[PDB]
Amino acid sequence: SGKTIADVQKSATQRIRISHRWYRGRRYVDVRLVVVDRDGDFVPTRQGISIRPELLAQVIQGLLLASR
């Protein structure tokens, strides 16, 4: 599917995965909750968002604003 850029460990069972995912000729930044399933593998969930490259700077500035 997508190439993993960063895996941020939330807990023993959960991570936020930031990946590049190509779709129909555009490279999205996918930010997604991945959780360990009954087999023990982390698997992506539907709790995630696709950021096209032109919005990525605004999203980062938003997170900086949200920092304390």
Q: Which residues bind its own copies (CB under 8 A)?
A: 5-6, 8, 10, 16, 18-20, 29, 31-33, 46-49, 51-53, 55-68
3-state secondary structure of 41: coil
- Edge-to-edge strand order for the sheet containing 42-51? 3-9, 14-23, 26-36, 42-51
Strand partners, 44: 34
Min dist CB 25 to its own copies, Å, is 15
What does 62 bind: Cl ion, its own copies, none (CB cut-off 5 to 8 Å by kind)?
its own copies
Q: 31, 57, 61: which is closest to 46 by C-alpha?
A: 31
Per rule CB under 5 A, is residue 62 in the interface with Cl ion?
no
Applying CB under 5 A, among 23, 27, 53, 59 the residue interacting with Cl ion is 53
